[PDB]
Nucleic acid binder design. Sequence first.
RNA 1: GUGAACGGUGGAGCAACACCUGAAGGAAGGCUUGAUGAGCGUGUUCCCCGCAUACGCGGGG
Length: 73
Amino acid sequence: CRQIGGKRGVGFGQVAGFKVEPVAETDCPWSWRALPADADPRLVTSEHARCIAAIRGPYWDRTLHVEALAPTP
RNA sequence: GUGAACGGUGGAGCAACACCUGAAGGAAGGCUUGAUGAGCGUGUUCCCCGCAUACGCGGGG
């Protein structure tokens, strides 16, 4: 990877660096994520809400948008 | 297959016009280039200082 985010053709947001380190199981919210509509409720927090949204793959593909429980940036 | 992928802030436009740094104001009052240094007296062994180390040298008045 060298850039992150959108509009990468006009040079926005090239990555200066990254660090990848292990963390505790209770210390990671991985569930802050576009979850399915029938996701198990220990992963569905108050930030998660119902939306027409992709949970996987190409997140821009509106044909693959599903009943989803997703948080907000 | 980074809600990604694609996407020109662009084109044009006078800081310019006119405007006296100028009026007044004493470099003067006093001051020998004249000297100064240019020539005019003593008539024979008397103190003291160093090198020596006394055989003598230099030397103060």
